[PDB]
Amino acid sequence: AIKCVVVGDGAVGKTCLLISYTTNAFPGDNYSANVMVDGKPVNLGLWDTAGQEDYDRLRPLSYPQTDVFLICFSLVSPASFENVRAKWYPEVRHHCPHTPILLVGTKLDLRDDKDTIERLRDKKLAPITYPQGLAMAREIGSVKYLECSALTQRGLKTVFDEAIRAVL
Ligand SMILES: Nc1nc2c(ncn2[C@@H]2O[C@H](COP(=O)(O)OP(=O)(O)O)[C@@H](O)[C@H]2O)c(=O)[nH]1
Ligand SMILES: Nc1nc2c(ncn2[C@@H]2O[C@H](COP(=O)(O)OP(=O)(O)O)[C@@H](O)[C@H]2O)c(=O)[nH]1
Ligand SMILES: Nc1nc2c(ncn2[C@@H]2O[C@H](COP(=O)(O)OP(=O)(O)O)[C@@H](O)[C@H]2O)c(=O)[nH]1
Ligand SMILES: Nc1nc2c(ncn2[C@@H]2O[C@H](COP(=O)(O)OP(=O)(O)O)[C@@H](O)[C@H]2O)c(=O)[nH]1
Ligand SMILES: Nc1nc2c(ncn2[C@@H]2O[C@H](COP(=O)(O)OP(=O)(O)O)[C@@H](O)[C@H]2O)c(=O)[nH]1
Ligand SMILES: [Ca+2]
Ligand SMILES: [Ca+2]
Ligand SMILES: [Ca+2]
Ligand SMILES: [Ca+2]
Ligand SMILES: [Ca+2]
Ligand SMILES: [Mg+2]
Ligand SMILES: [Mg+2]
């Protein structure tokens, strides 16, 4: 059994990431994947979390016995990205000083969307680029930086393959 916990700001796509991986369906708790690893079936337990401020005292109770964290931010929310540094990495790493952390950029499908880009440009903002995410990942000492889209499933299998590889 491997326990994986997904953390990050509200609305970055954590729930959709988990449901899309485990069910292969995109939505309109804790979940269960089986993965083969070198011809050995392995159970992967995926724990969703509430990223909101009003869960700040309760959320860390989910952290004990975690084998790997995914810190999620949305590739089209620069604020969710800044909070990796300002909130997420400092909380998880302090509470869990040795657990591997993967950094995952979500909503990869929106990064080249014209209207998402234009709405962002209105507030002097821009989607997060791969180089930017990679730099964040190295700064916080993440095992790996990965980008994905729960919606299209691009990159999604790799996220959980790499989560398991970090553990094993
Ligand atoms: N375009 C796109 N939208 C997504 C994706 N994942 C989640 N969303 C949307 O982002 C919003 C927040 O998703 P959710 O999984 O509930 O985020 P959570 O609050 O972090 O659990 C919802 O409207 C989802 O439909 C994705 O990969 N691509
Ligand atoms: N960076 C970080 N510091 C924290 C967190 N939670 C508590 N602290 C701080 O750690 C320091 C010592 O906390 P204390 O309860 O005495 O000791 P601890 O329980 O062994 O961590 C205080 O400054 C706390 O505010 C966290 O999630 N991240
Ligand atoms: N190893 C380690 N674990 C910590 C630390 N602070 C919190 N934890 C973990 O978080 C749990 C709750 O401890 P608590 O004192 O409420 O955390 P605080 O917010 O850092 O003061 C502990 O039982 C540990 O599992 C720390 O400084 N080192
Ligand atoms: N990899 C690694 N894991 C550790 C270490 N110390 C404790 N752990 C594990 O980290 C998790 C949290 O344990 P905790 O007592 O909070 O950490 P500690 O203060 O570093 O001993 C547990 O699963 C421990 O077995 C360490 O030095 N290295
Ligand atoms: N190694 C690397 N991968 C990237 C870079 N930019 C995007 N990707 C990844 O390659 C895949 C396609 O990303 P995308 O932004 O669509 O690249 P594009 O099709 O050339 O525009 C995704 O899995 C991304 O995570 C980059 O600069 N370096
Ligand atoms: Ca502490
Ligand atoms: Ca704390
Ligand atoms: Ca330690
Ligand atoms: Ca110590
Ligand atoms: Ca200790
Ligand atoms: Mg959710
Ligand atoms: Mg301490």
Side-chain angles (χ1 to χ4, degrees), residues 1-37 39 41-52 54-81 83-111 113 116-117 120 122 125-143 145-168:
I2 291 167
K3 180 170 168 175
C4 181
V5 180
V6 190
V7 301
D9 276 10
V12 298
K14 296 184 300 305
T15 299
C16 290
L17 168 125
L18 294 180
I19 292 167
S20 185
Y21 179 61
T22 58
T23 67
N24 299 131
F26 190 82
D29 212 345
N30 90 280
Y31 302 86
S32 274
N34 278 343
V35 179
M36 191 79 79
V37 192
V42 176
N43 187 271
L44 176 57
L46 306 176
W47 300 70
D48 202 349
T49 59
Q52 341 296 75
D54 102 300
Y55 281 96
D56 278 357
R57 309 189 294 158
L58 294 166
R59 169 196 323 115
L61 291 168
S62 296
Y63 295 179
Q65 289 78 81
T66 298
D67 298 310
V68 56
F69 285 95
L70 305 185
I71 299 184
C72 294
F73 70 92
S74 164
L75 290 162
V76 291
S77 168
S80 79
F81 186 59
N83 283 322
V84 167
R85 181 192 290 114
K87 173 168 195 164
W88 294 115
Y89 170 67
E91 181 180 290
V92 173
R93 179 54 76 224
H94 172 96
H95 278 263
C96 298
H98 303 285
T99 319
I101 289 172
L102 279 79
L103 184 63
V104 173
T106 61
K107 307 203 188 173
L108 178 55
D109 61 284
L110 290 179
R111 178 154 69 188
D113 178 55
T116 307
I117 290 151
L120 279 176
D122 294 344
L125 291 177
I128 302 310
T129 64
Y130 182 91
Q132 281 188 277
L134 183 61
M136 183 66 84
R138 288 182 181 175
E139 186 179 320
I140 65 166
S142 171
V143 174
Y145 176 55
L146 294 169
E147 301 179 329
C148 71
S149 176
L151 181 61
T152 73
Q153 306 200 122
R154 189 187 211 182
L156 196 60
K157 171 193 173 161
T158 300
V159 166
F160 296 97
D161 279 357
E162 292 295 321
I164 295 161
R165 174 176 297 88
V167 175
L168 294 190

